[PDB]
Ligand binder design. Structure first.
Ligand SMILES: C[C@](C#N)(COc1cc(C#N)ccc1C(F)(F)F)NC(=O)c1ccc(SC(F)(F)F)cc1
Ligand SMILES: C[C@](C#N)(COc1cc(C#N)ccc1C(F)(F)F)NC(=O)c1ccc(SC(F)(F)F)cc1
Ligand SMILES: *[C@@H]1O[C@H](CO)[C@@H](O[C@@H]2O[C@H](CO)[C@@H](O)[C@H](O)[C@H]2NC(C)=O)[C@H](O)[C@H]1NC(C)=O
Lengths: 186, 48, 124
């Protein structure tokens, strides 16, 4: 067996119809002689290689954009409150609903892939970070409620946190409420 | 408490402005896209 | 594919910018936005299964969904900025300086009128 190549390369592309999802980067052909245990004589094999590159815009829009928007919005909900001197509501329900939707998206996307264990795709790392931010963000929001609850349990006030808290206060654009200023003067 | 009332008033007016702004944006988006699409569809069969 | 999404988007807009009182703290609308956003994602996945999955063009329906998503997501942030503005009353007592003349002129055009308690405070 011998190969017959074209002007553009081993595989002709003069009549090729472009694919909407893949690009043909190039083609290769190799002629190799091989021995097999079933026969005392060699065999002649022709190897044709096609290199194809995916067009990513479709998958970025459909698999990454929707998840990023939801994750960004939920972050604001975790660390936002309507008042400074009022008890906060638990954000566990907000985290659970966001977490459960991402699980459905993972199952939907997982149906489009080989289901191999050899590698961890790039998109898998993106989803893992989104899950970690939401799950860890839920615990961080609950720790804010924990710190506020220390005021009721006894009256040991903050000892050294108050100087650190005041210096950080201007850099993160938050200012003291009027009642706290009145209490300090009193 | 008057200071609280004045900032309550500003927020009340502002969210009323948001309601009007986002209502027109919705109407022009839903209606505009479909009306444009129907226009392209209508000219194809009827003239081309 | 279009009618069900428009009805949900329109209803959610009203919920973002409606309140039962003027002088009470507002509830966050993040949960309302998240639930609406997550449903549209399922709608997008369902519709996406009926299409070639090409990358050459952006269909007419894709632009419609993008606008619906933007309105809900940007509308959620606009509703949170209303809570931010109201919270300025508690943080110190710097009253509005020049916003109050502008706020009063716009107030009649958008059909909203002052509560009685606010009018009583002004007279006091
Ligand atoms: C969508 C999917 C992808 N990619 C599919 O899976 C794979 C597919 C292929 C192929 N070929 C190779 C490896 C994997 C896996 F499974 F190694 F990722 N899976 C995820 O994206 C994912 C992410 C985090 C979590 S664990 C959490 F708790 F959610 F963080 C679970 C699933
Ligand atoms: C339903 C679907 C359509 N049309 C299918 O996709 C496509 C299909 C074909 C074909 N043939 C060509 C292009 C696209 C894409 F993907 F370029 F649009 N996709 C959407 O409608 C969409 C909208 C916004 C977002 S991103 C958000 F954050 F939601 F705004 C993601 C998906
Ligand atoms: C049959 O196939 C074998 C595959 O190994 C060929 O072995 C090559 O022999 C040449 C010398 O004739 C060496 O220069 C190459 O290095 C060998 N191959 C490799 C991979 O090293 C063999 O030549 C072929 N033809 C026969 C055996 O008649």
């Amino acid at each position: 067996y011998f190969p017959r190549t074209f002007t553009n390369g081993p595989i002709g592309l003069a009549n090729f119809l472009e694919n909407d999802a893949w690009s043909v980067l190039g083609t290769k052909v190799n002629r190799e002689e091989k021995k097999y245990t079933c026969c005392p004589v060699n065999y002649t094999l022709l190897h044709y290689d096609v290199v194809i590159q995916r067009k990513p815009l479709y998958y970025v829009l459909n698999l990454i954009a929707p998840t990023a928007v939801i994750t960004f919005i939920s972050i604001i909900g975790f660390f936002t409150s309507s008042s400074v001197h009022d008890l906060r509501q638990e954000k566990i329900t907000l985290g659970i609903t966001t977490l459960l939707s991402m699980s459905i998206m993972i199952f939907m996307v997982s149906d489009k892939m080989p289901s191999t264990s050899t590698c961890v795709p790039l998109i898998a790392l993106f989803y893992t970070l989104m899950i970690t931010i939401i799950s860890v963000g839920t615990l961080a929001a609950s720790s804010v409620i924990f710190v506020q609850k220390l005021g009721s349990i006894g009256n040991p006030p903050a000892s050294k946190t108050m100087k650190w808290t005041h210096r950080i206060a201007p850099f993160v654009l938050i200012q003291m409420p009027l009642v706290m200023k009145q209490a300090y003067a009193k | 408490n008057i200071v609280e009332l004045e900032w309550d008033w500003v927020a009340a007016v502002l969210e009323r402005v948001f309601l009007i702004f986002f209502t027109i944006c919705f109407l022009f988006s839903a209606i505009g896209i479909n009306l444009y699409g129907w226009y392209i569809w209508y000219t194809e069969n009827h003239f081309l």
